[PDB]
Design a protein around this ligand. Structure first.
Ligand SMILES: CCCCCCCCCCCC
Ligand SMILES: CCCCCCCCCCCC
Ligand SMILES: CCCCCCCCCCCC
Ligand SMILES: CCCCCCCCCCCC
Ligand SMILES: CCCCCCCCCCCC
Ligand SMILES: CCCCCCCCCCCC
Lengths: 218, 109, 54
């Protein structure tokens, strides 16, 4: 009647978005010429969400049209964004689980890799509530203050590791010493074996291995 | 019983504090002065828990990067002995004499 | 881009909505920012390697 005159552009992306998924989805089935990684998965999620936004909100407009249906606009908007969030968790959890599997294959200990996966799960969940704190549940001023205090506590705790990372970056950029150079890093002397992100390994003339944090060195 | 009883009380206090945060406005009132005082209390608590969080981070790092493993003779800053186990907050080593030493992970790192 | 935005303010007949165009117009320029800005950093890295850095 007088409503299709506005949906034409929306249907254009809907058809394009629907065809876009097929092109990319079948590409994964037909081998993988490009690096798999997580970039393709993000696009898949990024293209999938548009369909929900295109067609979930397409139905939202359909309702703006036929108000006869008791269906209320608020619930649809809540469901539309709520549904996409769920796909975010399921889609995002798979990559982390996949990453853990590769880590185990590489040679890392099961407990070494298991602990790493748990740390990602906790951090990813914390970020998820931040992005849906208002839509899901509630986010109050007291809640914001407590979360900021928790973030400050975490940042203060991670001061040593960040200092070591910065010192390692500096040691990599400015080269006071290199692998194979006899040095004396504050009371300890020995051939330098390797400089890493958090610490460097040197082998004293006696024959023992010493590991020194980069921050202390700097 | 005291080990578990104390743990339960800590959860009760923290859970109640969160409950008022979620219903501070609906139940009772939440003013700017109240928000400032609660933020100051949270900052004080975070500053107090700095050592434990540092130990936790150091333990995570020691688990990820493995400078030593259970059964490896090491010298962690003036103390030497076979490493028995690496935990979240501290690791236990047994000196050659035969005594058990517990060292916080932050100090080790 | 905003010239076409005004062109639309003019011919509202086209279902095209003003919001999408503004979103696309600023979104497109942002992409050029990344592609344009990444080239200089990559170029800088090439010079650094040439200078003698590892
Ligand atoms: C109108 C929005 C008001 C937001 C108030 C945020 C208060 C944050 C306090 C943080 C204390 C550390
Ligand atoms: C197992 C412990 C994980 C980290 C918990 C951090 C809690 C910080 C609370 C700060 C309150 C102001
Ligand atoms: C309060 C949370 C602070 C988190 C800081 C993360 C910094 C990461 C630096 C890069 C590590 C490889
Ligand atoms: C985690 C922080 C990494 C960056 C550390 C600072 C490096 C500054 C180098 C400046 C060279 C001129
Ligand atoms: C309109 C909302 C105003 C909220 C004001 C919050 C003030 C927080 C002060 C925290 C001081 C540490
Ligand atoms: C309580 C904080 C736990 C996380 C500590 C930081 C771990 C960073 C590891 C980075 C490896 C590249």
């Amino acid at each position: 009647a007088e409503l299709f005159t506005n949906n034409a552009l929306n249907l254009v992306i809907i058809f394009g978005s629907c065809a876009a998924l097929i092109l990319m989805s079948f590409w994964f089935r037909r081998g993988n010429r490009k690096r798999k990684g997580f970039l393709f998965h993000a696009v898949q999620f990024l293209i999938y969400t548009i369909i929900i936004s295109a067609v979930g909100s397409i139905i939202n407009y359909v309702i703006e049209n036929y108000k006869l249906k008791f269906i209320t606009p608020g619930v649809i908007d809540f469901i539309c964004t709520s549904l996409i969030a769920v796909i975010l968790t399921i889609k995002l959890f798979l990559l982390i689980n996949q990453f853990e599997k590769q880590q185990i294959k590489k040679g890392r200990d099961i407990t070494s890799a298991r602990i790493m996966s748990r740390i990602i799960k906790i951090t990813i969940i914390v970020v998820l509530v931040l992005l849906y704190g208002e839509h899901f549940g509630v986010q109050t001023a007291s809640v914001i203050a407590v979360l900021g205090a928790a973030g400050l506590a975490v940042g203060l705790a991670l001061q040593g590791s960040l200092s070591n990372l910065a010192a390692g970056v500096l040691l990599v950029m400015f080269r006071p010493f290199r692998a194979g150079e006899y040095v004396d890093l504050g009371g300890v002397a020995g051939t330098v074996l390797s400089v890493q992100i958090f610490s460097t390994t040197m082998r004293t003339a006696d024959g023992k291995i010493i590991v020194i944090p980069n921050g202390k060195i700097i």
